[PDB]
UniProtKB/Swiss-Prot annotation:
Function statement: Taste-modifying protein; intensely sweet-tasting. It is 100000 times sweeter than sucrose on a molar basis.
GO cellular component: cytoplasmic vesicle
CDD domains: TLP-P (cd09217)
Organism field: Thaumatococcus daniellii
S-S bridge residues: 9-204, 56-66, 71-77, 121-193, 126-177, 134-145, 149-158, 159-164
One Pfam family from the record: Thaumatin
Top-level taxonomic group: Eukaryota
Name by which UniProt lists this protein: Thaumatin I
Length: 207
């Protein structure tokens, strides 16, 4: 399948795409403002993620640091990213359908549209100034708005036991982005698409 990753923001991002234990395609790439990067993801992938990283440095070989979303210091992510990271999430060709979501469960850093480029299903977006509003205790020095599980490590915020409810903080993300997951047991805002759809991830969409 095809993912076209478009930086519509006015600042450079370093896009990332991983499943957790391996890169997807090249695993990451600088995107200056306006730059598009199309990747290939295998049918049937489960639990894929696409995110932005901000304020990175990488040297000639590719090792470095980013202030949000860092994946073990690699330009080319083979693992997931340090919060706060807004997340595009997907598992493809499940049993005849792909399923797409955007998640604020690791926080928010960059506004995002995740829309299908082929018919049948609707996209999802979170574009609100979450970082401009972000509750004071959830702010990340380095940039972004952390989730409460990251800042406080409690069973309730982290839904450790498989039981939890919404919180003042989950609800701060759900007031600003009802279509994105705001905590682990949120009512799902997942989208079911035909198997083998293609997609566009747009950062800063409304930019």
């Amino acid at each position: 399948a095809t993912f076209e990753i478009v930086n519509r923001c006015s600042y450079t991002v370093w896009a990332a795409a991983s499943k957790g234990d391996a890169a997807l395609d090249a695993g990451g790439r600088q995107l200056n403002s306006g730059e598009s990067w199309t990747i290939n993801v295998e049918p049937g992938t489960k639990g894929g993620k696409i995110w932005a990283r901000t304020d990175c440095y990488f040297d000639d070989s590719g090792s470095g640091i980013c202030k949000t979303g860092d994946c073990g210091g690699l330009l080319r992510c083979k693992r997931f990213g340090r919060p706060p990271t807004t997340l595009a999430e997907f598992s493809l060709n499940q049993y005849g359908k792909d399923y797409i979501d955007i998640s604020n469960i690791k926080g928010f850093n960059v506004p995002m549209d995740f829309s299908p480029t082929t018919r049948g299903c609707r996209g999802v977006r979170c574009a609100a100034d979450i970082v401009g509003q972000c509750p004071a205790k959830l702010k990340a020095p380095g940039g972004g708005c952390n989730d409460a599980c990251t800042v406080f490590q409690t069973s309730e915020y982290c839904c450790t036991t498989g039981k939890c409810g919404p919180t003042e903080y989950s609800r701060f993300f759900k007031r600003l982005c009802p279509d994105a997951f705001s905590y682990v047991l949120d009512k799902p805002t997942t989208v079911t698409c035909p198997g083998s759809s293609n997609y566009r991830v747009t950062f800063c969409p409304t930019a």
